[PDB]
């Protein structure tokens, strides 16, 4: 499916980094996006978690061992805060 996805500026820069350097990472992120759209914020692949503390309102799924997709969904529209760990 074609999904309309909103990114934070920093998440978009990181997504572009993966497009340019790690296509397998892009494929995984896109599979997570597919699952969020098909099954909702909390259901499907990547061990979805409702975040707490001052991350409340957002969710995490595991892209790989270190990177998390941090996102929320409003009226079926996916918003990405992060797709790459900022060390």
């Amino acid at each position: 499916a074609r999904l309309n996805i909103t990114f934070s500026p920093q998440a978009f820069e990181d997504y572009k980094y993966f497009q340019q350097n790690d296509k397998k990472m892009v494929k995984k992120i896109n599979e997570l996006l597919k699952s969020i759209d098909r099954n909702g914020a909390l259901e499907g692949i990547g061990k979805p978690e409702k975040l707490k503390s001052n991350l409340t309102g957002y969710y995490s799924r595991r892209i790989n061992h270190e990177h998390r997709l941090v996102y929320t969904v409003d009226d079926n529209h996916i918003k990405i805060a992060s797709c790459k760990y900022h060390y």
Partner: protein
């Protein structure tokens, strides 16, 4: 239930990235694209 939140917060640089990026989403500083999945 808290481990993943703490993982994201444990490095202050990642915490700052998330705080700024959440603010950007909530304040309308965003980039939207069509992605085929």
């Amino acid at each position: 239930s808290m481990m993943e939140t703490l993982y994201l917060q444990q490095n202050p640089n990642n915490a700052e990235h998330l705080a700024q990026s959440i603010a950007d989403l909530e304040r309308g500083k965003t980039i939207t694209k069509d992605i085929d999945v």
